[PDB]
Design a protein around this ligand. Structure first.
Ligand SMILES: CC(C)=CCC[C@@H](C)[C@H]1CC[C@H]2[C@@H]3CC=C4C[C@@H](O)CC[C@]4(C)[C@H]3CC[C@]12C
Ligand SMILES: Cc1cc2c(s1)c(-c1ccc(C(=O)O)cc1)nn2C(=O)c1c(Cl)cccc1Cl
Length: 240
């Protein structure tokens, strides 16, 4: 069916843009920052940690932009709608992708080549927001997302006809309905429909991610970093 091909193309787009390989991430779980290395990060200036973390986060976004660009029918949307969907959803996808890099056993994340806890980031002074991000990954870790499940769920995070400001809402609805069918179909074929009831509630991802982006906007205002835009019109609604 056109649906099994849509499943295959979404998984392919994901596989090509997932940035880090699951085998690598799982294999390096034992490669953990030492007390001294942690202290090294904690003593850095707020502004150097910000530069590092901002560069890594914009690179994560760019992989999500390529994921979207390779999604069947994503380019056939009007550029306004491309921007609206990426502007509402790209960071939500990055926060979802974090669960693959996150180890629930010791509440660590993969960062510059090893695993560390949220205290790595103490110099940024965002204790409560970073803790929220870690908690969200802790929740998503319990689902043991397969790669294809992550691919199909993140596709649906982006392709959402409820985002305000769409010019061709019906064209987005058609992608969304197809991806919904692809996702349900896949879950049925793998006996994993049970994850549907365990998915994060939409307002949760939305309000966590809008706080995150709001804090990044504030740091970017106090201490601008500069990046070579992959999607210039989209860069402009965030680097404006
Ligand atoms: C609040 C603030 C100013 C910063 C947030 C600090 C911290 C929570 C950020 C900084 C770098 C991020 C990772 C970057 C890259 C990836 C790879 C992606 O494929 C999956 C996600 C992941 C691992 C990001 C996770 C969140 C990190 C650690
Ligand atoms: C939903 C989205 C939020 C968000 C996006 S999209 C982008 C972004 C990045 C690059 C490109 C591109 O074209 O290369 C396009 C978009 N940055 N960003 C941020 O929150 C952000 C980051 Cl990650 C770092 C520093 C400052 C900020 Cl404000």
């Amino acid at each position: 069916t056109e649906i099994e091909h849509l499943v295959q193309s979404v998984c392919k787009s994901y596989r090509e843009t997932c940035q880090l390989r699951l085998e690598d991430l799982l294999r390096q779980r034992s490669n953990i920052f030492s007390r001294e290395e942690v202290t090294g990060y904690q003593r850095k200036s707020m502004w150097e940690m910000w530069e590092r973390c901002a560069h890594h986060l914009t690179e994560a976004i760019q992989y999500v932009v390529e994921f979207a660009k390779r999604l069947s029918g994503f380019m056939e949307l009007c550029q306004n709608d491309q921007i609206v969907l990426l502007k509402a959803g790209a960071m939500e996808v990055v926060l979802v992708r974090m669960c693959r890099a996150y180890n629930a056993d010791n509440r660590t994340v993969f960062f510059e080549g090893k695993y560390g806890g949220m205290e790595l980031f103490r110099a940024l002074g965002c204790s409560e927001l970073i803790s929220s991000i870690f908690d969200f990954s802790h929740s998503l870790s319990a689902l043991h997302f397969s790669e294809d499940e992550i691919a199909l769920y993140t596709a649906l995070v982006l392709i959402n006809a409820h985002r305000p400001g769409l010019q061709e809402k019906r064209k987005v609805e058609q992608l969304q309905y197809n991806l919904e069918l692809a996702f349900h179909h896949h879950l049925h074929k793998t006996h994993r429909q049970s994850i549907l009831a365990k998915l994060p509630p939409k307002g949760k991802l939305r309000s966590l991610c809008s706080q995150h982006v709001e804090r990044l906007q504030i740091f970017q205002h106090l201490h601008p970093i500069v990046v070579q835009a992959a999607f210039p019109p989209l860069y402009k609604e965030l680097f404006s």
